[PDB]
Structure 1
Amino acid sequence: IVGGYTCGANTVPYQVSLNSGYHFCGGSLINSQWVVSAAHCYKSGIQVRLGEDNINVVEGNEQFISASKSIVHPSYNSNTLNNDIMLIKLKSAASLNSRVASISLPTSCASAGTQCLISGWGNTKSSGTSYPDVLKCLKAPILSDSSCKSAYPGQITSNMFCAGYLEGGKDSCQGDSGGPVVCSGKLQGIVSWGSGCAQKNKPGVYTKVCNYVSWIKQTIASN
């Protein structure tokens, strides 16, 4: 997250870190057994880390649970990033509490202008590199589909939306991928892609979760 703030420990209780020896992507806890992330984050050998603030220090509220299964969306295209969503099942159920909590799925799509919370452990610099230990947060609005398409000609599908600031300076970034965009208490987006980070006229692009609720629910119900 570039241009954001320190969230505070366990203030974003649905945020998870995906770990394969090292943090590599975010995700969102949607029930005791299942995490939502980006398909481009797929790899084997995932350990889900819940209850994290500093990802390099054991602070006392963590739950580390290995994934048993991951399910990339059936129509994910890694070239275009269309349908950049995947589900990860935990080998054992998380113990839900005030600091480890699921986030609700939306019932309707969000609108441009809605303010959302974007979070992660990704790069905090737009020109260099600096990776934080503690969770960072950014409040940002959803942008109009016409502004989004104009920013990224030929690249924005109906399964994507833009959020952020056209002036630059405030965005998600590498290492935030897979993490949440939460608006009014609902998971509306997944950190997906962008041109660099925090660049003028190049807002963040997010997977549009509302399009996937029926796939998420039916997949969980049979897996």
Structure 2
Amino acid sequence: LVHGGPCDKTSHPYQAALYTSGHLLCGGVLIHPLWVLTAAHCKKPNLQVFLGKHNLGQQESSQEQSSVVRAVIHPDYDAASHDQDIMLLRLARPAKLSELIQPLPLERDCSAQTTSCHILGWGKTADGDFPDTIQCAYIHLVSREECEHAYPGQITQNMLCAGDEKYGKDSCQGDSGGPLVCGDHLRGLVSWGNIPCGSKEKPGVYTNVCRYTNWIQKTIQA
């Protein structure tokens, strides 16, 4: 995450850290004790999910680790365009809830009125390094028309755009699959955007979570 700052220790109980080969790969969102939502392009071998983490460089009393027993990629995910960039991970060990481990409810209304939004993650910062402490930033949803102008022919109905006019606060590599939170609800998942990261003109592109209500519920209940 670029141009942000360290999160408040108690503000992100839904945040998951996804690892492969002992290295951080992606972000994720806890949505049920047994399920974590992430981006479909985060599919890698033997994913290890860490909940209750704030600082990746230290062992924390609140942390809970679990392997993945099932990875469910949306049937219509298109890797080249990032269309339908969503995947459900079933935990081997269900999340033991605490003040620092809680699910985040989903935004089910695609026409939800404008609320305060924020992004978070252990992705690439402004200096180009990967931080040990989770970063946070307030951003705003960008109109579909302005986003279409930024990325001609690339924005689908399964995508949302958000960014920051002032400093270009934006998500980056490592934050993928992490949450775009609007009014204490999951509005989006970090998917793609400007390289190098920065949203002053080209906003961050997020999976439009409201579109996947039926698919998520059908997968969890299957």
What TM bracket, shorter-length normalisation? over 0.9
**Structure 1 range deviating more: 193-202 or 14-23:** 193-202
**Structure 1 range deviating more: 106-115 or 80-89:** 106-115
Corresponding residue for residue 214 of structure 2? 214
Q: For 1:24-39, list aligned pairs within 5 A.
A: 24-39=25-40
Corresponding residue for residue 120 of structure 2? 119
Corresponding residue for residue 45 of structure 1? 46
Corresponding residue for residue 176 of structure 1? 175
Q: For 1:91-106, list aligned pairs within 5 A.
A: 91-106=92-107
Unaligned 5+ runs, structure 2 = none
State the AA in 2 paired with 1:209. V
Q: Report the Cα distance in structure 1 between the residues aligned to 2:105 and 2:200, rounded to whole angstroms.
A: 32
Q: Report the Cα distance in structure 1 between the residues aligned to 2:156 and 2:166, rounded to whole angstroms.
A: 23
Q: Report the Cα distance in structure 2 between the residues aligned to 1:36 and 1:148, rounded to whole angstroms.
A: 24
Following TM superposition, by how much is the alpha carbon of 1:172 offset from its aligned partner in structure 2, in angstroms? 0.6
Following TM superposition, by how much is the alpha carbon of 1:8 offset from its aligned partner in structure 2, in angstroms? 2.5
Q: Report the Cα distance in structure 1 between the residues aligned to 2:142 and 2:199, rounded to whole angstroms.
A: 15
Corresponding residue for residue 54 of structure 1? 55
Q: Report the Cα distance in structure 2 between the residues aligned to 1:118 and 1:42, rounded to whole angstroms.
A: 21
Following TM superposition, by how much is the alpha carbon of 1:110 offset from its aligned partner in structure 2, in angstroms? 5.2
Following TM superposition, by how much is the alpha carbon of 1:113 offset from its aligned partner in structure 2, in angstroms? 4.5
8 Å CA contact 1:114, 1:142 repeated in 2: no
Q: Could you say what secondary structure the match of 2:82 adopts?
A: coil
Corresponding residue for residue 187 of structure 1? 186
Corresponding residue for residue 18 of structure 1? 18
Identity %: 45
State the AA in 2 paired with 1:165. D
State the AA in 2 paired with 1:130. D
Q: Report the Cα distance in structure 2 between the residues aligned to 1:104 and 1:83, rounded to whole angstroms.
A: 20
Corresponding residue for residue 131 of structure 2? 132
TM-score norm. by structure 1 comes to: 0.94
Following TM superposition, by how much is the alpha carbon of 1:154 offset from its aligned partner in structure 2, in angstroms? 0.9
1:85-121 alpha-carbon deviations (Å, 9 max, x no partner): 0000001211011110000012212557532111100
Following TM superposition, by how much is the alpha carbon of 1:60 offset from its aligned partner in structure 2, in angstroms? 1.1
State the AA in 2 paired with 1:4. G
Corresponding residue for residue 158 of structure 1? 157
Corresponding residue for residue 89 of structure 2? 88
Task: Say if 1:134 and 1:199 are closer, same or farther in 2 by CA, change over 3 A.
Answer: same
Q: Could you say what secondary structure the match of 1:142 adopts?
A: strand
Q: Report the Cα distance in structure 2 between the residues aligned to 1:85 and 1:166, rounded to whole angstroms.
A: 27
Q: Report the Cα distance in structure 1 between the residues aligned to 2:53 and 2:123, rounded to whole angstroms.
A: 14
1:128-153 alpha-carbon deviations (Å, 9 max, x no partner): 51111011111111111111111111
Q: Could you say what secondary structure the match of 1:30 adopts?
A: strand
Following TM superposition, by how much is the alpha carbon of 1:166 offset from its aligned partner in structure 2, in angstroms? 4.2
Corresponding residue for residue 4 of structure 2? 4
1:12-60 alpha-carbon deviations (Å, 9 max, x no partner): 0000000111111000000100000000111120010000011121021
Q: Could you say what secondary structure the match of 2:211 adopts?
A: helix
8 Å CA contact 2:163, 2:199 repeated in 1: no
CA RMSD across the alignment = 1.4
Following TM superposition, by how much is the alpha carbon of 1:11 offset from its aligned partner in structure 2, in angstroms? 2.1
